[PDB]
Every structure is written in C-alpha cells, then in structure tokens.
Amino acid sequence: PVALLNDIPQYDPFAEHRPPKIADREDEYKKHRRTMIISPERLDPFADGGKTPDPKMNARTYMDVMREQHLTKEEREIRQQLAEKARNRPLSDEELDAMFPEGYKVLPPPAGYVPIRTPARKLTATPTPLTGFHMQTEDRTMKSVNDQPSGNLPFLKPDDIQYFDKLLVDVDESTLSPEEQKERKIMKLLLKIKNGTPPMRKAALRQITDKAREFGAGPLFNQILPLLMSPTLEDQERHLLVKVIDRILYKLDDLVRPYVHKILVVIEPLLIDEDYYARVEGREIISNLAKAAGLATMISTMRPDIDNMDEYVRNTTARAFAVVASALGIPSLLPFLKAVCKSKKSWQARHTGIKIVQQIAILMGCAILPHLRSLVEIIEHGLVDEQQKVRTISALAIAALAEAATPYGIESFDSVLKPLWKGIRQHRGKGLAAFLKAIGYLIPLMDAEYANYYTREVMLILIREFQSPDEEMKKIVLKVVKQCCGTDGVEANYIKTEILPPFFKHFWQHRMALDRRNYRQLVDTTVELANKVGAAEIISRIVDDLKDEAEQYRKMVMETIEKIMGNLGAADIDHKLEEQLIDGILYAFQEQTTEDSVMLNGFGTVVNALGKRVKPYLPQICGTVLWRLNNKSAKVRQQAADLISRTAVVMKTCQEEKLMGHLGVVLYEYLGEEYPEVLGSILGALKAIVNVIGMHKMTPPIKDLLPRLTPILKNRHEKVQENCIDLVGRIADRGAEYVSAREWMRICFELLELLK
C-alpha cells in the first residue's frame, strides 16, 4: 500500500522563523488600512504669495475635494436605493487610466481577440480537453534574464518588485535626459535604507537627509508613501520609513504644504495601533507636521474628513486633530471646534467634534484649565440631544474633562450637573454607564454639601449595577466605587454593611483576573475599600484565595494583600488571621509555574510588616527554603535563593545563630552552581546576609569567602557579574584586611576585564 503512503492524510514551512508582519495583527476594521489610496495632486493656496490663480491646473482644491466627496455620498445613496429596488464591480476607461502609470500602450489585439474574449467568457466548457523524450537545444536567454539590481545594492524581495522594478533594467544615465528621472533612480536608494546592513542604512540616511531640499518633496513622498502603504511591510521596515519621513519633514519645513493630507492618510493609522511606540512616533510626527505646515493648512486639509462616511477616518482624524491642537494651542483652534460641534445638518460632525474635545482632554491633560469653561460650553449642548450616540459621547467627554481637571473647574461644570443627574434616573443601558462615569468623576471635585447628597443618591444606583453583566458596565462601577465610596465624606459602617458583601460576591471572579485592565482596576478599588474599612476585614475576606488553583488569581490576591499591608501595616491582624496569612503566603510561594516578582514582594512586605511577630515561623520558613534549594529544577532553586535574600533582615534580628550560620554556610556550599541564573541569586543572598551580620562575624569568614569568589569573577554572565562585583566591593571596602596584597592585585587584573 505504498500508494497509501504517498497519499497524505490531510506550502511554506519557514513561518516559525520569519519576523511578524504588521498586516497580521489586524481585524476587519483595521483591514481598512490598505483600502485607502493616494489621492491625486493637490494645489497649495499659499503659492506665489497668494497668487491670482491661473486655471487649467489639474491640481485639486477645497472645492474639488468637497465636490468629489458629496458626489460619492450621493453615489452610495443611489446605489443603496437601486439595491432596495433590486469591489469586484467592473470599472471604466478613466478608472483604468487613473490607476495605471505612464509609458503604456493600450490594445485589444484583434477585433477577434476582443471577439475571442467575447466567446472565451461565454462558453469555456472544454472543446477537446488537450509528452516524451526530446533532446534540448542549448541557448543563453534564461541565463541572460536578471532580477536583482546589479551593483552593491541589497537583495530585492519578490514582492517589492512592484516598487523597485525600475532599478532592474539598467541603461546609461545621460540616456535619461529627464534629470527628474535621474534623481528619481538615485532616490530609490530607499531600497538601501529599507533593506540593508546598518552601514548602508546609516550612509543612505545621511545622504537623503542632506539632499532632501535638492530632491524636493514631490519625488520623495511619491516614492516613500506607497512603501508605507504596502501590505506586506513588517515592523522594523515601517519604523525606518517613518523615521525617514520624520527627518525629511524636519528639513523641508514649508515645502510639505501640498503633501500634508497624503502624509496624514498614511500616518493616522499609527494613532490607533497596538505598538505603544508606533502610537508615540505617529503622535510625534503629526506634531512636527502641524508645526511645519501651519494652522490654516491643517484646518483646510482635514476639514472634509470630519464629515466623512467611514468611521475609520472620522476616528483617526479626530485623534490627529487633538494632536495638532496640542501642538498649536487650543485658543487658535477653538473657533473651528465651536463651528464643527455646532454644525446642525449632520450629527456625524457633532459626534466627531465632541470626540475631538474628548481627545484633547485625554492628551493635553492639565493644560485645559484656562479654557475649561469654553470647552464645557462647547460640549453641554450634547448632553440634551436626542440622538443617543452623541449624548453618550458628550457624557464621556465630560468625564474625560473632569479627570483632566481634578480638583478645579467645578464652577465650570456647574451648568452640567443637572442634565446628568436626571439622565441617570430615567436612563437605562449604555447611557447609564456613560453618565455614571461622568458623575463619578465629578463627585471628587465637589464641595461636601453637594457630594454628600449626590453620593448617597448614586450609591443607590450602584448597588443595583453590581449584578450587571455588561463588561463596560462592570468596569465603570469599579472606577466609580473607588471614587464615590472612597471619600472623606462617608461612614465606615455603611460600606461594611452594604457594599462589601455584594462587592466580593460579584467582582472577585476568575474572569477579572484574566482581563488585563480589570485586573488592576479591581486591585485598586479593593485597596481603597481597605483604606476605609480597615485591613482586617478585606484580608479576612480574601486570604483563603491564596490557596486557589488559578495562579493569575492567587497573584491578584497577593498583589492586593501586599499593597494593603504596605500601606496600613499589620496592627489589626489578629492571631488566626496571621496564621492563615502566613500559610497562604507559603503555599503561594511554593506554587509558581511562572517567573514573576509578585509572590517575592508579597513575602517580603508581609514579613517585614509583621515585624517581630514572625519569630514563631522562621523555622518553617527556613526549613522550606533549604528544602527547595535542593530541588531538581533551576527555577525553584533560584526562587528559593531570592526569598533568602529578602528575609535576610528578620532571620538575623531575631538571633538565628543555628539558622543564620546555617544559611551562611549552606550558601557558601552552593557557590559552585553551574546555572548562571541560580548562581547570581546565591551571590545576592550572600551579600544580603553580609549586610546585616557584619564582616567580622560572617560564618564562612571573609578569609574563606573572597578566595572562593575571585574565580567566579571570570564568569562573563551578567547576573552573576553584577552580584559578584557588588559582594567584592563590600568586602574590598570594609573587610579589606582579611585578604592579601597579592589577592588584591590578582583581583585588580581580573577587574580590568569587567570594564567590558
């Protein structure tokens, strides 16, 4: 059955080795990133000092752009209408001339080749479904075809052929009588930047950034921007290309005035992106763009996109707007805002303006205070609107503003406490969540004779939303509870009676731990509730979870317990509680599948907070650490040498002679470990003991310790080199006479190569 062996039950196998591409992190919404095209050429209005314009330009202007847009909107309109009546959609002659470049001759071969096409599509059902040994006739052509740019250029991949194919055919320069074409080719050293060794990159970068002005904007961006829109471009390539745009954007200051919209169409997607550095870089170059091409250009350029019909570009334009507002100043942009957000034909523009306002609050932060009232009046017409969406976004923008103006501006918000507080009661669903966020953020900013009434009203709604399934709902009430039930104007017993029970029933679940923002938010409000109701209560509620199966969950409860006891201290921890606490601590320490300092700092802080009440447990602690020091896997041995270095203060201050000499000399015995990561932590533990029990009574005397370390100095690994020279620095500084002059000269000579 060898045919069965050729038959495979159920291609490129190198995937595991290739660097990830950006276009793979995408969704159906970010997949709209390539569906955008470079617009044709755009006339700048400030050319010839404000010329009287000679028409017959072929260079678009504001009017042309708006006519295109509204025409297309009517296009979609009638398409949907006709579709009620009844991408691959074929295209026309000028579509084809609009997408193809120049140097091209268009032809149906015959009127019969057009008629062949007519029969070809019609019936292709096979009219006859149509070798042997032949000897070959030697030739040269396949040898003669070349596909790599001859010269000292990098390797040109099999898809950027589209962008760099002009480099492949080589002919003399003076044949190319367009010097525009000559500089075009020489500027396709973009390849040497995109792909290249670091020397090639450095040299080409300097070249382009010096020759930028001579090259001119047009050529540059015409080559650079399709690259940035290429679908297969991965991460480092994009970072290099945007760094290029950055430097030439700084050298050409004004000359970008016609290309600002193209640059934006390409850079905007960086603003909503998962890579934090992508967002920061996009923000930074949009800032430099706004500074270089002044206000009027930016305003005129990005106005037609507020009213766009793709939420994608509405959103990214909003964020870009907030960036240019940060860069140029609100007072200069504020009239334009008022305008757009009070536009009355389209609610899309109202939404987008209110959203720009939200983003300004998010970004500029503190600097909105001088304009706070102007912004709030811009926005308060939205809390009353009838279209539910813009109501919700106005409430969100109010919450953003309040957060950006913590305690201040309350008399500016004064106008707005009413629309919220009544929207709260007679609202239900999502607006409820949004208005709740808003009122919660205002509650801190308020004087007590206001906050008391508002709070005691709101907590009523809150208690009801503790059972809400919605994920945004739950996250909002977590934030709110943290603010509302965590002021100076509440009374502990009410919390202890009415908030804690359903709080712990509905919020401490495994789903929360699993989420990444809900994790920290739940940790924070639990620490706040601790601050009010005392530690003992919260702790006694969650100690039994230090023995839970989900590690992420144990680590949530360890992070809170640790933060709490760090703040409050353990004065109220009774006996049975400190018992269950030390037990859960130990167990959680003994199960770490992961690598993380959570349980380590938990142990450290809990122990150094119990202080001297931890005497009766040092034998269990010490015994466990010695036993885990002898285990078969280097993760647990290394974690047990960490715990020693942390509790090295307690174990001494409670006069552990048996146990402390135990630790000193046991560690000295382990000093031969062959796992660098375990040895570094052994050395850290030794130095932690040397710090508390001084030089002249260390159990392995310094006279035996230092000779044991001088051969370790050659270890070339960073963790062990770190800890080793710290220990030898202590000894050289303080011990320094338990050693011979010749040992010190030996160590001199061994140090001269840690300078590496």
Binding site: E579, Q580, Y587
Partner: peptide
C-alpha cells in the same frame, strides 16, 4: 493549615 490537615489525615490532632 497544612500541618492541621496532615494531622487530621494521619491520626488525632
């Protein structure tokens, strides 16, 4: 606690 559990299982506490 773990020691308590051990004792319960082994014999009398």
């Amino acid at each position: 606690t773990q020691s308590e559990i051990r004792d319960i299982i082994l014999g009398m506490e």
